[PDB]
Design a protein around this ligand. Structure first.
Ligand SMILES: CCCCNC(=O)[C@H](C)C[C@H](O)[C@H](CC(C)C)NC(=O)[C@H](CCSC)NC(=O)CCC(C)C
Length: 370
């Protein structure tokens, strides 16, 4: 069953996680970034300095041109291309072939990453945010419509080259410990969720919970950092600075520009706090919390690290540094996202990443932004 999909993801730190796919007839093999923050399937289809290979439409007898252009902008990076369809398979996934929409990327700007080893992107979110419009059916919708694959997938992203698993069509219980805790998908466009409380080293940030979700909160395997709205980012950095005031850092460290180093094995993990995000639960007035260790938001790049929490003007993004400690179930069928402690979690000496509940939280619906 699912054992064939365990360990089907690879990556380089800070450069995304990718799965192997084939497109066209005869099959052309490509490494494809797994991106829950978007909804277009697109591949390099022309030479590029950072591409070692690309999709050659003229060599595929099953390619069909849709005679329509497309452009997709991301938080950082963008591409344009030509829409079409072709047959697609996932060698270390389910034994199926689907005809899917594919954008052939012909021009791009700050999209491909030098040395990342991937040549395309698999947008796993919903049609509502697909370009050029929501009539372009995303890959996973095509997969579910054309085969018997159930309407869900799960991601285990493993940190410190990196690896992981994308279980297509189900949940693999060997990939997590403890219980799964579920939060509602607020609206099917991004994987949007509602954060109802934030604590740092056990102290409530004491902000209006609308601030945590201004103007949305999303889960995105294609973003490295935890990205926070301006007011929340400032409160969080103020608290983290205070907890670590024992040591001194450049001010560009807190902006993500400069790295900090310590003698190998002497990193003072103890002076950096844990961060708890409380998420809306499945029953009335109930939440649960996920706890993040500094080993997740200090990304290794002697031992040197970059601060991987940064400021956003488009809402909270729960990126890889959040997802890396957990097994995350995208349960589209039941419109919910599950979190459990990952089997590939990092080890602090006295602290552990956790998923804990239940908690009582009043007036949770008021935390969503309108
Ligand atoms: C069209 C509507 C949907 C748009 N969705 C998005 O823009 C989502 C929120 C972001 C999307 O996941 C892209 C993916 C990237 C590979 C381009 N990520 C980024 O733009 C983020 C922006 C970071 S701002 C410090 N890129 C990274 O974190 C760098 C590492 C990645 C190459 C793995």
């Amino acid at each position: 069953s699912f054992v064939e999909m365990v360990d089907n993801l690879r990556g380089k730190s800070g450069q995304g996680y990718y799965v192997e796919m084939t497109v066209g007839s005869p099959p052309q093999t490509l490494n494809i970034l797994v991106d829950t923050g978007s909804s277009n399937f697109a591949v390099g289809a022309a030479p590029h300095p950072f591409l070692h290979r690309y999709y050659q439409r003229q060599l595929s007898s099953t390619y069909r041109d849709l005679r329509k252009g497309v452009y997709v902008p991301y938080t950082q990076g963008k591409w344009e291309g030509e829409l079409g369809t072709d047959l697609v398979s996932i060698p270390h996934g389910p034994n199926v072939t689907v005809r899917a929409n594919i954008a052939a990327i012909t021009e791009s700007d700050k999209f491909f990453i030098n040395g990342s080893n991937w040549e395309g992107i698999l947008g796993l979110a919903y049609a509502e945010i697909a370009r050029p419009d929501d009539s372009l059916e995303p890959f996973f919708d095509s997969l579910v419509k054309q085969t018997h694959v159930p309407n869900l997938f799960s991601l285990q992203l493993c940190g410190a080259s990196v690896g992981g698993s994308m279980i297509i069509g189900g949940i693999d219980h060997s990939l997590y410990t403890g219980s799964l805790w579920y939060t509602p998908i607020r609206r099917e466009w991004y994987y949007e969720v509602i954060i109802v409380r934030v604590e740092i080293n056990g102290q409530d940030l004491k902000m209006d919970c609308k601030e945590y979700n201004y103007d949305k909160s999303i889960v995105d395997s294609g973003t490295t950092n935890l990205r926070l709205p301006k007011k929340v980012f400032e409160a969080a950095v103020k608290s983290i600075k205070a907890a670590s005031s024992t040591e001194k850092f450049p001010d560009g460290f807190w902006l993500g520009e400069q790295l900090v180093c310590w003698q190998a094995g002497t990193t003072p993990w103890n002076i950096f706090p844990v961060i708890s995000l409380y998420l809306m639960g499945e029953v009335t007035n109930q939440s649960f919390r996920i706890t993040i260790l500094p080993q997740q938001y200090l990304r290794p790049v002697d031992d040197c690290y970059k601060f991987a929490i940064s400021q956003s003007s488009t809402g909270t993004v729960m990126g890889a540094v959040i997802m890396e400690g957990f097994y995350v179930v995208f349960d589209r069928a039941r419109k919910r996202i599950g979190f459990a402690v990952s089997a590939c979690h990092v080890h602090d000496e006295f602290r552990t990443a956790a998923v804990e509940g239940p908690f009582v939280t009043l007036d949770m619906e008021d935390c969503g932004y309108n």
